[model samples]
Target: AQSVPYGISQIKAPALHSQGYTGSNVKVAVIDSGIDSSHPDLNVRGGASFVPSETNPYQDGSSHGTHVAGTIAALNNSIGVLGVAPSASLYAVKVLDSTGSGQYSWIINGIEWAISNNMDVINMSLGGPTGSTALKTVVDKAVSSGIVVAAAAGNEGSSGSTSTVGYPAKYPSTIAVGAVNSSNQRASFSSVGSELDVMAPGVSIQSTLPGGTYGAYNGTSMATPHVAGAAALILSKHPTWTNAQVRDRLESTATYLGNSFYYGKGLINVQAAAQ
Candidate 1:
């Protein structure tokens, strides 16, 4: 499993922009390990820390959130790695703690906050096997409030395991994403099945890290943000698109790779989606 290349080239960005995805003022909420607010490649506004009120959400202790942030809206200023929607604004919500682990309660709180702030898109690149009624309730609330929520489909691949689908991702209202390679093949570690809505480049992805550096990581964690950014791109064009409309557009406009487990509806074509 070689690392996938990182750039706007893999996606049809020029076409997306032509379809009107300039990402001017769209607000995308990243609920992960927190973002490097001062990263040259990131345009962070502000965020909250839900780590038991004892940690700093301002710092990206794990660096996974920073990478995810860069994928969504890294400033396209000829820097290390360009984002899918470089001009969009990012709101870092630290639901997961420094070690990339958090309770479902914290995630629910983050979703609540994003809804209250009227964020257009919320990306949760972290999830576990547990299911929670409280978490599902909050996710439903976010969908009702017209916020597009996207999540990772988990790193567990299809092994005929019953509970491999993972939580929040399996939730009916959210967009569950799996990892795809440049060739449009599903990563061996990407979770699959009917629960998946779309696919994105998540293997060997390069993006910003803490302390002004860049690195690559793999997981459904990296795949989820691409869809989140694409949602922002669509909203940038059609501000009135409901959550269902947005999700439908994403599915309908995707490129079918013919592998149901790997590509779902297909690779997300952000440009086509905007049109």
Candidate 2:
């Protein structure tokens, strides 16, 4: 556990791992910019990209997706950072481009692919200001099909407002995740609203980046993976649980943070959820 990300400890991922739940049979789809397949810390099986002129989804030019992937399923080996569910097979479904942004259609395409492939979990760390009916349709379809969907709650908390959570996360079917810091406090950058479902480590989260290096990042983007990984852990433990059941277990077991808007159910404890 020496080099594991601090978020892992905060969520008690290592404890779940020690209890023989490594997300071994889970198939997780990371829908974002892309993933660095060559990164030593990751075990990216394969991926696809809807962005034009980009054929390899494993080639992470934006570095954001790779970092997000690392937080969810980086290898459990001793050398580098270990993910919350390190044994889950990871797939990189690229929607965003090298600029860290993408169109709604690209994201929808990514979602379609994940649902079609029967991904156990889909982690989306990207979002926009307005919601999309097309996106919501696929999100609902994924949930109905038993694919656990996790999306960022957004990063507009500095405005000191409400309903700041944007699309995908704004959709009721999706698991909206806010951000918490190492001190177990809600991150100021984490968007808040009734839509938010849970919170996890997001501030200064150290994870794999492009070029075989690790770096710290901020945003609900970092927090989303913790919930996604916890979902994987729960799936590994209870393979027969429905998508709704998994969502409820995570939400119901969360350590409450005193408010629904700011912290949702509170920071997730993966070990508790898995047990």
Candidate 3:
């Protein structure tokens, strides 16, 4: 029997789990490559593909989305590792293709799908250095429609001195997340920016992969789902809370780890948010 992963443990997800807040019925859209619906450790409710060549969202070609989805809501079974919100419903909105390359329009469509499908939270583990109006418009629309959006800050932390956070995370409406290790130290590859909203475990994160297996990856991409799952947990506890309220709780309840530029409000404390 596998135990809870270290990232989930570090964020104190079990505290909320013990309180019966496993993000039950919460809808989260994993806007990335896709998810492995057949993964025994995952329970992907449904999904759609924006990738023209890859029509099926259940078959994750890149394995990136599945890993991110696992971190958010891997099943709480005896086999494999547990996720933060084990009961949260997962939707694979495949925007990035198998090669992990995507254009702005695909992402825009992914956001629209989330809004149309009434997803409660959207987890975007992908980003680009540049920003555009169409992407911003869709992200704004999602937030205005009451969907809590969380995205990776980017994996461009060099010299640790400048704003490397990528879009749509750079957009004020979305929550930009950076990465930290088990020791709470910022990952060298985690982008630092004034806009960074929070920090979560990102280094060597173990999660479900394609083909019903498990693996570890390192990136702000890995960190984004941690925050996404935390949002799910909070929503499960405060079902009536608005997206803004949930974001506020996540930021305010976070443990102060360091500077705001590096850690934002700091490491997420899911138990405190649940309370």
Candidate 4:
């Protein structure tokens, strides 16, 4: 574990920084459709493309990545937005293609790369009902390597089945994040189940988009970043904590609102976790 000062440089949050916690020195990988390299608020460290056809990983064709990156580490800027862990370095581990979809092998490869590079956190906002053992193995391996893995619980809440939760998130090791609206109620489209690890603000969430713009989006997609970004914050405060410890701190400190099926322990509270 890399130890650093609690304050996040450029974050300028004296309330939190004075307490000696910032996501500085922590590396977070957004394994999605790649990042829009041109976004002003996003100062991307670097990225890699798993897709065969995509040469420039920074060219986020679908624009989904820009939004996800914005939600996690969109920098503390006056003209634009800010993220959960504004000081964390963002890496674009591009697993999904322009269409926002990819095979399991692609994601596994991305996970492996993140682990090899010592990424402190990995955020996978993509999932499906059916998945592969190879994918599950990599996710578990990432957790074993001390990387906090967070993923979407999926948008299959209407299915009304425990099995509706998708892979990666379904895995016991990953931090499965569900979605809730502004009212803190479960989103109609956010999947729920025993495997659901936590919930976050997902409905109409404002985040960064491509071309120096911002927009509102919904889904477990929007919510996953909240927890992942919160995980970065937790790691920033407790730099020496293991992945399991970080997971416990997050779930235990969450503002419990309901049972595990609906809201997990409750919505993730970064403020409480930081304390």
- Tell me, by TM-score, which candidate is best: 3
For candidate 2, lDDT tens digit of each residue in 17-124?
888998888999999989999998899987789988677898989999999999999997766798999999899999999998998899889989998887999999
Which residue pairs in candidate 1 have backbone atoms (N, alpha carbon, C) closer than 3 angstroms, thus clashing?
Answer: 16-271
For candidate 4, which ten residues in a row score worst on lDDT? 1-10
lDDT of 4: 0.81
Cα displacement (Å) at residue 122, model 1: 0.4
Q: Encode model 1's per-residue lDDT on 126-210: one tens digit a residue.
A: 8888889999999989988988999999998887734366889989899999888877788889998778888889888888899
- The lDDT values for all models are 0.83, 0.90, 0.93, 0.81
Residues 1-275, candidate 4: write the lDDT tens digits. 11111211211233454566547778999999999878888888988989887867787888888888888887775756667777888999999999999888889999999999999999999999787889988999999999999999999885565556788899999989988876678888888888998888788777778888787888898888877787788788788888888889778888787867888888877767666
lDDT score of residue 92 within candidate 4: 93
Candidate 4 or 3, higher lDDT: 3
TM-score for model 3? 0.98
Q: Specify the poorest-scoring 10-residue window by lDDT in model 2.
A: 158-167
User: Runs in model 3 with CA error above 4 Å?
Assistant: 159-161
Which order, best to worst by lDDT?
3, 2, 1, 4
Give the alpha carbon lDDT tens digit for every residue of 138-199 in model 3: 99999999999999999998554778899989999999999999999999999888889999
What is the number of residue pairs that collide in model 1? 1
Residue runs of model 2 more than 4 Å from their true location after superposition:
158-161
Compared with the true structure, the alpha-carbon lDDT of candidate 1 equals 0.83
